[PDB]
């Protein structure tokens, strides 16, 4: 019967919260008191990419820290040399309502998805000189709501009907599919080495899986209410994640828990897009408040601010390098920001 | 600059003059999300705008008067929808059509009619209402089999308004429903709506051939009251 | 994790009186817009009543609107339904349900048929 089901999965909660509790000996609060302040971090916008007709919803840039890709719902993606403003790509979609687009580690592929709930990935450089779909991947049963390739030929993705998959790129199909999301899965993260992803989906969790395996390691759920962005630490040990709570929290996948939630009361939105910089120590976050924040992910100060957006910020990220930080929002435009000294 | 640099600035211009060509077609075509349960005629209304002529989303273009409409259907999603609708947030209007004749299933369809209205969102987004399957209505209230006090228990101490057209032969307890479930919709409407947005409600049958030109004066009359809010003079 | 303790209900005969509690764990309450949702056997999930932050605005479906009353307590996170003149057609199991995100007044998804925000229930019997 369903209720000794549901009393022993209750012991197995308390279970794995005293495990959690037993570790918890000393809070990263506490740890990071003696370290320096990071300062007031403050950024100009360096370069404004404009010509979206209309809202930003995703952005990806590439590994080589220069080119960009950018989604609008006038179904254009725009690839823009973020040195130049010049604008090296621009795809007509099959649909406008695009909601994620990813962009290849080789650089030579680009991904784009949404509410027709089909993955198109599209080559750049074919010996005819013109981009074209080479492959539609379709067997998701709810909007794509973000893909990363992991490979040249492996892109894994994450939809509203609950479940994420990989699939394989030339023959169409997936290899495995990722369940046990309760509600809409939101956002990926692949860690630096690709053997594992986070995903946050629209319920209490996250959720960490193991691409080979096909399976959950560990579950999160330390948030009040839906994971729209998700973020690894750098290290790969640990990952951000961004809420409606109008909170960001940072988990670790080796102490299995929070360590420190990032929340100032004089803000009540709800959380858009995550990064973190190069070193960890910034973490960047976009929110429904046309702006954007950076945190001291050791201390949680409030360290800086980049009010530069008229519209609800929609995707954020930093360059490999770790030399500039795009942000884009439904007023149309691309903003990127660095500091000087 | 010299050689790939100045090759580079030429396409990025020649990229320039196709996105300008784009714009024209994207600001003169206008988009509408029709939203409705799965007993409202949804369906059948879009059959019948071919007159005017897994996959998550379906498109539906029709011209009225040289005026390009985009209507979206949305297709194979799960039923929660929070996320999702937020990518409608510039469109110029919900299409939102209502089964009147299921009077145990109006309270949810008013429920979602409030999650529309208050979202953040949405708020921008006016609401073309079809109050559909009006013949329906028409024979169950006629009929009197089935109650709707017992649904809805103020229907009793609600009398038809002046401001009231009915059809010829239209009997006054037909009248007097049909009234009470299209205020029952105004009632949200105009509890929160602060000027950015309106709703406009239709009573229609799904054999209805007027619908596209319904569509198109409730987009015009959208468009003007949005741009003479601009000016100031309304 | 966030959790619903819906905890009152059982049988009664018509014209019968109960009071459902729900216990909330796991997010700061007071932030939220709170509902009632109901299930009677072979039918479909459907909306009973609504509760603001603080009482601000009450509401119910029209099938209810007299006989069942939602009170509120923010200080020990408890929501609750008391039903004053039970009938066969209220015997259905009983949901509270949480609004997705705090600070809104949009109560999206709340009768979906998979929601995370909506507890275990408890089953009311009209004999």
């Known amino acids: 019967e369903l209720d000794q089901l549901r009393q022993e999965a209750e012991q197995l909660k308390n279970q794995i919260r005293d495990a959690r509790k037993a570790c918890a000996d000393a809070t990263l609060s506490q740890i990071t008191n003696n370290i320096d302040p990071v300062g007031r971090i403050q950024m100009r916008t360096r370069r404004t990419l404009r010509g979206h007709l209309a809202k930003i919803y995703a952005m990806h840039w590439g590994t080589d820290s220069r080119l960009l890709v950018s989604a609008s719902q006038d179904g254009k993606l725009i690839i823009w040399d973020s040195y130049t403003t010049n604008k090296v790509h621009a795809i007509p979609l099959r649909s406008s309502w695009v909601m994620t687009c990813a962009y290849a580690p080789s650089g030579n592929y680009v991904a784009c998805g949404g509410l027709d709930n089909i993955c198109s990935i599209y080559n750049l450089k074919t010996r005819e000189g013109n981009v074209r779909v080479s492959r539609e991947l379709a067997g998701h049963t709810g909007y794509l709501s973000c893909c990363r390739f992991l490979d040249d030929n492996q892109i894994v993705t994450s939809s509203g009907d609950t479940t994420c998959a990989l699939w394989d790129i030339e023959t169409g199909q997936q290899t495995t599919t990722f369940t046990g999301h309760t509600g809409d899965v939101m956002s990926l993260s692949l860690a630096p080495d690709t053997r594992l992803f986070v995903s946050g989906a629209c319920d209490a969790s996250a959720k960490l899986w193991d691409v080979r395996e096909g399976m959950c390691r560990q579950t999160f759920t330390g948030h009040e209410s839906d994971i729209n962005a998700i973020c690894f630490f750098p290290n790969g040990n640990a990952f951000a994640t961004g809420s409606d709570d109008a909170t960001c929290r940072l988990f670790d996948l080796r102490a299995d828990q929070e360590l420190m939630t990032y929340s100032h009361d004089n803000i009540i939105c709800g959380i858009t897009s995550v990064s973190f910089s190069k070193s960890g120590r910034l973490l960047l976050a976009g929110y429904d408040d046309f702006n954007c924040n950076v945190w001291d992910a050791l201390k949680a100060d409030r360290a800086g601010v980049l009010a530069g957006h008229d519209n609800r910020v929609s995707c954020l990220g930093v360059t490999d390098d770790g030399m500039a930080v795009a942000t884009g929002s439904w007023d149309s435009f691309l903003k990127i920001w660095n500091g000087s000294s | 600059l010299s050689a790939e640099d100045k090759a580079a600035v030429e396409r990025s211009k020649m990229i320039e003059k196709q996105l300008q060509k784009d714009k024209q077609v994207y600001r003169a075509t206008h988009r509408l999300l029709l939203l409705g349960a799965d007993n409202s005629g949804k369906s059948t209304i879009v059959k019948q705008m071919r007159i005017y002529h897994t996959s998550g989303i379906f498109e539906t273009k029709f011209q009225v008067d040289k005026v390009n409409f985009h209507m979206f259907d949305v297709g194979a999603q799960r039923d929660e929808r929070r996320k999702w609708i937020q990518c409608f947030n510039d469109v110029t209007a919900i299409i939102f059509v209502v089964d009147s004749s299921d009077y145990n299933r109006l309270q949810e369809a008013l429920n979602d009619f409030k999650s529309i209205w208050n979202n953040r969102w949405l708020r921008t987004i006016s609401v073309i209402l079809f109050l559909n399957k009006q013949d329906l209505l028409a024979e169950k209230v006629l009929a009197g089999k089935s109650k709707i006090e017992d649904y809805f228990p103020e229907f009793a101490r609600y009398t038809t308004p002046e401001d009231a057209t009915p059809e010829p032969g239209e009997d006054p307890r037909v009248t007097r429903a049909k009234y009470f479930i299209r205020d029952e919709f105004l009632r949200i409407s105009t509890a929160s709506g602060d000027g950015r947005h309106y709703c406009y409600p239709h009573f229609t049958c799904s054999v209805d051939t007027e619908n596209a030109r319904r569509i198109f004066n409730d987009c015009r009359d959208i468009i003007q009251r949005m741009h003479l809010r601009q000016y100031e003079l309304l | 994790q966030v959790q619903l303790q819906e905890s009152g209900g059982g049988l009664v005969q018509p014209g019968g009186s109960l009071r459902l509690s729900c216990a909330a764990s796991?997010?700061?309450?007071?932030?939220?817009?709170m509902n009632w949702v109901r299930q009677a056997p072979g039918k479909g999930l459907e909306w009973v009543s609504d509760?603001?932050?603080?009482?601000?605005?009450?509401s119910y479906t029209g099938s209810v609107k007299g006989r069942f009353t939602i009170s509120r307590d923010n200080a020990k996170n408890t929501l609750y339904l008391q039903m004053n003149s039970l009938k066969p057609e209220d015997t259905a199991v009983y949901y509270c349900?949480?609004?997705?995100?705090?600070?809104?007044?949009?109560?999206?998804?709340?009768?979906?048929?998979?929601?995370?925000?909506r507890g275990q229930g408890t089953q009311v019997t009209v004999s």
């Open positions: 509760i603001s932050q603080s009482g601000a605005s009450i």
């Open positions: 349900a949480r609004c997705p995100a705090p600070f809104t007044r949009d109560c999206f998804d709340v009768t979906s048929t998979t929601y995370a925000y």
């Open positions: 796991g997010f700061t309450f007071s932030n939220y817009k």
